[PDB]
From TrEMBL, chain B:
<keyword id="KW-0808">Transferase</keyword>
<dbReference type="GO" id="GO:0003968">
    <property type="term" value="F:RNA-directed RNA polymerase activity"/>
</dbReference>
<dbReference type="GO" id="GO:0000166">
    <property type="term" value="F:nucleotide binding"/>
</dbReference>
<dbReference type="GO" id="GO:0003723">
    <property type="term" value="F:RNA binding"/>
</dbReference>
<keyword id="KW-0693">Viral RNA replication</keyword>
<keyword id="KW-0548">Nucleotidyltransferase</keyword>
<dbReference type="InterPro" id="IPR007097">
    <property type="entry name" value="RNA-dir_pol_reovirus"/>
</dbReference>
<dbReference type="InterPro" id="IPR026381">
    <property type="entry name" value="Seadorna_RNAP"/>
</dbReference>
<dbReference type="GO" id="GO:0019079">
    <property type="term" value="P:viral genome replication"/>
</dbReference>
UniProtKB/TrEMBL annotation, chain C:
<protein>
    <submittedName>
        <fullName>Vp2</fullName>
    </submittedName>
</protein>
């Protein structure tokens, strides 16, 4: 009923750019951690049995 | 960012309020010693004893304490010897002051410090008795034909009349040493009469001629303000302690010691101090006031009476030749009621074309008289101001002469002498007869209810000087826990069963002299009329005026003549008073508040490039002698002319019954009252009048008719002369004619500029028809010009306004200030300060004066205790809620950021400060002791006529409805009679109740606020026009520039007045006793859904009922806003000058919600308060009902 | 500073404003008590009216 008009200010865009950098860094770190964990789990643990 | 600035300004307001209260308490800490205890109103328990001399009453609420006020217990007066006592007083001069009356003790010790500073004052010469006065006493009797004067008959008092061997102006009281002849022989017809001249001149003249009634205790004021180091205070002291001139006050009267008019010097010096402080006069003005205070200290009053004429002649021509362009306004739509002041560009250089008659010979004669008196500097500055430019300092210097005249205060001539002076052409009589006839015809056409016999009783009730009145005798008893054991005496206060409670009785026996009480109790005097009532005498009243103007004498008509006048002449007066929009200026209503609107045509003419338009002002004096004789008979014939329209009538006057007499008889009796001489008495002197007679409700009509006839004949004569010798003719544009003062604008027909020949010819008036003395007096009285005009103490000059200065609150007639309750006194002071701010006084000076006035108020006195409440009651509800920096806006204190608990406790305090229980108790006991007082005619006349079940629809009949309903009318009527009577005891009981309730911890619960809303502001543009009030403060002029100026057409009308108009216009529809206030209150009690049923139970016929319902529906906001405050003493002139109406609401208030009209208007005024507060600083804002930025992310619109 | 924020949020937490609250309260106040017993038996109570309109 009382929908507001979304207004994009310069400060919001700057904050969004900062968060874009943060997300890029965090995605890269997650990828590296996943690769390391895959290597560890392949090298360490073998098959399981009943 | 306007909202943040507004919030900061409110916070500064709170800070200023706290500082002001703290300063008040610190200042009161010196008059009484430092507070000894802090008594908590609720937490602590005290038994009304063992409380110290000075205590601070606090109240605790929500873990916080607020400062209610101060209590003073006069039993423990020993503490007061710490600051003031006879032991410290040592100097021999002040011992006599102490012995005369102890009230000076404080001031005395203060004076001693000055004496211990080493400085000593010198004695001053007191002027002695001038023997020639003995020749000026005349004792008239029948032997000398009462000195051959017609008006005087049956006189047993002396008269001060001018004589060759007598001093000039004998009536005016002179300051004299009291060692003058105790007993002087009088040379009457027998020659053996002896008169105690000293006794009469010391007793009668010190009270009748020169009353002094200070608003506060004069000793306290002298201590607070009269600083010895001030040169004026030193000069007065030289006249006060030097030569040992002593005076004091006992009860209401003044007692002197060695010199007459001693207290007048005190009045004059305090007036000098206050006026100099308020006006913020420049150094030159300070010098001329030093000169005047030196010159008139010898005789406080008589010197002013000498220079009245010179001062008037000089002030008439102030700014006559001004080179300055000044303001400019448009002359468009000048001849209609809808005229408004609008700006319009004017080409420079119009000053040479303007011309104002100066009558230079008289100006130089007045200047020479001023030099002879020794007022050289004032004469020089007035002469300079005659031709100077326009500046606030210049206009203050011009009005400085009237400032000087305002020094004396309330001064009047001898009562009997004033009586004898005041009391003593066929075309003209034809014109005045025609004008009176046309006025009577219009009045009878507009309001014809008087003729009908049925409406006579209602009109008589709604509408004195009757010989016989009833008397009420009884004893009023009440229980007081406030006195002491010592005070118990068998006469008044009785020791009762309770150890601490006493019973105080006061014996009353008083006559119900008021018009309404006499009307209800004794109507046969008003109704029945005998011929002999045209010959009986009626007591007269005397009213002194501020300044040195002539004393006013009021001569009421007799009751029967009053009823006849109500029936016949009242419609004409009512029609004359009513002026509405869309009417021509030269109309009956148009020809005859807000200074700018009333003087608007003159204000526009005096600032205009057009030079054909001229302003002519006429003042008529001593026209009662002209009113004697022919024109009185002309008025009588004009009234008689209406008898041809009414059938039943008698040839001559006969005794009649008011409700049975035909209208012709009433018209004839009014004509006889108009034309026959009437007898009046006061102070043992009886006089007869055949002129205007100063009869109430009739002076205005007769005076304006005579003035209209004068103007008509004068204009016709000038036109005839202009035809005889070739000169451009004149034509009347608009006119205003109030009392004997008239101002009209005349336009030259051919458009040629005004010439001194034209002005001279118009001034000459009746040339070759009357004596040269008439021409001379006409020249002295009137003025004609294009630059400066005057009317009812309003001075207009080149599009600028100037008000009068004779207005203050320290000294008042009849000392009524000292009788009212605390809140009424606060309201009176506030109102006087407000009306001061519009003229010559800024917020700084006026607010300082107001704070000092507050600091010296007497306080609630009861028994031997005194309460001084906190000064923060101004912002509280019930008092005018004001912010200090913006005092004009009333009821603005709610929005201030005061703590909620603090504001609540303040509201309860101010609510408890006024109670209605004592009046109810007094009325109830009077009824139980004296019984019924209403006549049987009013008992039978007020009966239920609408034929409606009293039970109603079974709805809840409240107390007010039962009071006003017809079947219970009789008791209600009696209450009115007993509400007429006023006596000391009700207010002493009120003070006692206030004291007991306050100290016991009982605070009355304040009523809720009708309207309250926070409005959020935004920037916007200007709308108004610059203020003609040049002398006014900067804030008011800024408000005029932002919002605008108001007008009588656009001015709002109070709902009570509207309901009164509706009731009066339709007599017989509603009971006569019903007033607008009562109906409005009972409607405000009930929900509107049942309002109709309510008006059925009040026996209101349909024409009044529907209109009353509509008024209540549309105008309940005004009644609800001012419900809890008695606005009888509030005439907010500065607030009225602002334009707050429907014309300015759309540009400054934005309300989008759907609300009823009353609520909408109330909230519009609420927004207007914020708008005015902001606009006082020159910022124009728009109010909205919603913030622009609720959240840091969200922003709102519309 | 929290008081100003709370007062501002009051405007958005509800669709009413003090003007409209006063207008609505001017309708049901004293309405039920004034009428007779029989009419009172066939009209809503004041608390009921406040519950409906708020």
């Amino acid at each position: 009923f009382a929908l507001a008009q979304i207004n994009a200010d310069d400060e919001f865009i700057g904050a969004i750019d900062k968060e874009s950098a943060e997300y890029l860094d965090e995605y890269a770190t997650l990828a590296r951690d996943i690769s390391n964990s895959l290597t560890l789990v392949k090298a360490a643990f073998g098959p399981l049995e009943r | 960012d306007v909202q943040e600035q507004f919030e900061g300004y409110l916070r500064e307001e709170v800070d200023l309020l706290n500082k002001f209260e703290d300063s008040h308490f610190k200042q009161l800490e010196i008059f009484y010693t430092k507070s000894q205890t802090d008594h908590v109103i609720n937490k602590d328990k005290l038994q009304f004893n063992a409380l110290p001399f000075h205590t601070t009453l606090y109240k605790e609420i929500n873990g916080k304490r607020v400062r209610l006020g101060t209590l003073l217990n006069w039993t423990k007066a020993e503490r007061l010897d710490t600051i003031r006592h006879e032991s410290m007083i040592k100097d021999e001069r002040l011992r006599r002051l102490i012995d005369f009356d102890y009230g000076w003790i404080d001031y005395a010790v203060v004076l001693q410090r000055y004496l211990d500073e080493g400085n000593t004052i010198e004695s001053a010469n007191i002027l002695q008795f001038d023997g020639d006065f003995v020749n000026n006493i005349k004792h008239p009797t029948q032997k000398n034909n009462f000195l051959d004067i017609k008006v005087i008959k049956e006189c047993e008092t002396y008269i001060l009349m001018k004589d060759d061997n007598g001093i000039r102006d004998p009536d005016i009281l002179r300051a004299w040493e009291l060692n003058s002849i105790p007993e002087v022989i009088e040379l009457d017809v027998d020659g053996e009469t002896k008169k105690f001249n000293l006794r009469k001149e010391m007793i009668k003249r010190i009270q009748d001629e020169a009353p002094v009634y200070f608003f506060c205790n004069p000793y306290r004021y002298a201590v607070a303000n009269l600083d010895p180091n001030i040169p004026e205070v030193r000069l007065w002291l030289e006249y006060f302690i030097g030569s040992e001139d002593f005076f004091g006050f006992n009860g209401p009267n003044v007692i002197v010691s060695k010199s007459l008019l001693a207290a007048k010097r005190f009045e004059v010096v305090v007036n000098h101090l206050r006026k100099v402080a308020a006006f913020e006069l420049d150094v030159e003005s300070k010098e001329v006031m030093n000169e005047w205070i030196k010159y008139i200290m010898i005789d406080p009053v008589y010197r002013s009476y000498k220079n009245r004429g010179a001062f008037g002649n000089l002030n008439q021509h102030v700014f006559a030749r001004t080179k300055s362009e000044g303001l400019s306004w448009s002359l468009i739509d000048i001849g209609t009621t809808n005229f408004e002041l609008k700006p319009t560009k004017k080409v420079a250089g119009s000053y040479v074309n303007k011309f104002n008659l100066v009558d230079d010979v008289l100006v130089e004669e007045s200047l020479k008289d001023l030099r002879n008196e020794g007022l050289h500097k004032m004469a020089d500055v007035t002469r300079r101001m005659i031709d100077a430019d326009i500046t606030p300092e210049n206009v203050k210097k011009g009005k400085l002469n009237r400032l000087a005249l305002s020094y004396c205060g309330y001064t009047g001539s001898h009562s009997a002498t004033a009586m004898v002076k005041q009391f003593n052409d066929p075309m003209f009589v034809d014109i005045v007869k025609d004008n009176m006839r046309v006025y009577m015809q219009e009045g009878l056409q507009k309001y014809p209810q008087g003729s009908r016999k049925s409406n006579r009783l209602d009109i008589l009730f709604k509408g004195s000087s009757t010989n016989e009145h009833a008397v009420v005798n009884g004893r009023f008893r009440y229980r007081s826990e406030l006195y002491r054991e010592r005070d118990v005496n068998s006469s008044t206060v009785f020791k009762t069963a309770t150890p601490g409670q006493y019973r105080v009785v006061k014996k009353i026996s008083a006559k119900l002299k008021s018009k309404n009480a006499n009307i209800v109790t004794h109507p046969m005097n008003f109704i029945n009329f005998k011929v002999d009532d045209l010959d009986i005498v009626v007591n007269a009243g005397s009213r002194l005026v501020r300044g040195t103007r002539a004393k006013r004498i009021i001569t009421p008509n007799y009751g029967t003549i009053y009823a006849a006048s109500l029936m016949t002449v009242l419609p004409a007066v009512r029609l004359l008073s009513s002026r509405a929009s869309n009417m021509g200026a030269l109309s009956t209503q148009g020809r005859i508040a807000l200074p700018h609107d009333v003087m608007a045509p003159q204000l526009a003419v005096t600032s205009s490039d057009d030079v054909s338009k001229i302003c002519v002002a006429k003042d008529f004096g001593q026209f009662d002698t002209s009113q004697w004789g022919q024109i009185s008979k002309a008025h009588a014939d004009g009234v008689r002319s209406m008898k041809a329209h009414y059938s039943m009538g008698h040839d001559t006057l006969v005794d009649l019954d008011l409700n049975d007499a035909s209208f012709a008889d009433l018209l004839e009796v009014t004509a006889m009252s108009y034309e026959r001489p009437l007898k009046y008495k006061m102070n043992g002197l009886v006089c007869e009048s055949a002129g205007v007679k100063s009869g109430e409700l009739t002076t205005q009509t007769r005076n304006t008719t005579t003035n209209i006839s004068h103007s008509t004949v004068a204009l016709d004569d000038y036109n005839n002369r202009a035809y005889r010798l070739n000169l451009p003719k004149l034509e009347l544009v608009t006119d205003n004619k109030v009392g004997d003062d008239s101002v009209e604008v005349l336009r030259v027909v051919d458009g040629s500029p005004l010439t001194p020949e034209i002005a001279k010819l118009y001034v000459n008036c009746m040339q070759d028809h009357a004596d040269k003395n008439h021409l001379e007096i006409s020249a002295k009285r009137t003025i004609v010009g294009n630059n400066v005009a005057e009317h009812i103490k309003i001075w207009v000059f080149k599009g600028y306004l100037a008000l009068d200065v004779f207005l203050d609150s320290v000294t008042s007639e009849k000392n009524s200030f000292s009788n009212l309750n605390y809140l009424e006194q606060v309201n009176i002071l506030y109102d006087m300060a407000m009306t001061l701010m519009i003229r010559y006084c800024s917020v700084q000076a006026c607010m300082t004066q107001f704070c000092n006035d507050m600091k010296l108020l007497n306080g609630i006195r009861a028994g031997n205790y005194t309460f001084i409440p906190t000064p923060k009651i101004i912002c509280a509800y019930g008092t005018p809620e004001i912010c200090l920096r913006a005092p004009e806006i009333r009821s603005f204190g709610r929005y201030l950021p005061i703590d909620e608990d603090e504001y609540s406790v303040l509201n309860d305090l101010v609510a408890s400060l006024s109670t209605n229980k004592p009046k109810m108790d007094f009325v109830a006991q009077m009824f139980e002791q004296n019984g019924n007082q209403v006549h049987g005619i009013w008992l039978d006349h007020f009966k239920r006529k609408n034929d409606v079940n009293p039970d109603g629809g079974g709805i809840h009949i409240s107390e007010g409805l039962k009071r006003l309903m017809p079947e219970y009318c009789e008791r209600h009527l009696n209450e009115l009679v007993y509400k007429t009577l006023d006596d000391k005891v009700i207010r002493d009981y009120t003070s006692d109740i206030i004291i007991t309730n306050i100290c016991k911890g009982k605070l009355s619960k304040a009523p809720k606020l009708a309207f309250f809303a926070n409005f959020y502001l935004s920037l916007t543009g200007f709308n108004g026009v610059d203020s003609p009030y040049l002398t006014a403060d900067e804030g008011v002029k800024n408000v005029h520039r932002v919002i605008g100026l108001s007008y009588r057409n656009t001015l709002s009308t109070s709902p009570t007045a509207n309901v009164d108009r509706i009731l009066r216009n339709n007599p017989g529809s509603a009971p006569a006793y019903l007033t607008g206030n009562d109906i409005l209150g009972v409607l405000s009690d009930y929900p509107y859904q049942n309002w109709r049923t309510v008006v059925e139970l009040l026996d209101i016929t349909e024409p009044s009922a529907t209109a009353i319902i509509e008024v209540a529906t549309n105008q309940m906001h005004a009644y609800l806003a001012d419900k809890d405050l008695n606005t009888a003493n509030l005439f907010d002139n500065t607030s009225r000058t602002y334009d707050i109406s429907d014309r300015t609401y759309p540009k400054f208030v934005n309300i989008t919600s759907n609300l009823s009209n009353s609520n909408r208007r109330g909230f519009q005024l609420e927004a207007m308060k914020h708008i005015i507060y902001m606009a006082r600083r020159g910022i124009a804002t728009l109010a909205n009902t919603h913030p622009s930025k609720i959240g840091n992310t969200v922003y709102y619109d519309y | 500073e929290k008081q100003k924020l709370d007062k501002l949020k009051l405007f958005e937490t509800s669709p009413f404003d003090p003007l409209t609250i006063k207008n609505n309260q001017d309708v049901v106040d004293k309405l039920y008590a004034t009428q007779s017993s029989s009419i009172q038996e066939v009209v809503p109570t004041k608390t009921f009216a406040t519950e409906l309109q708020f």
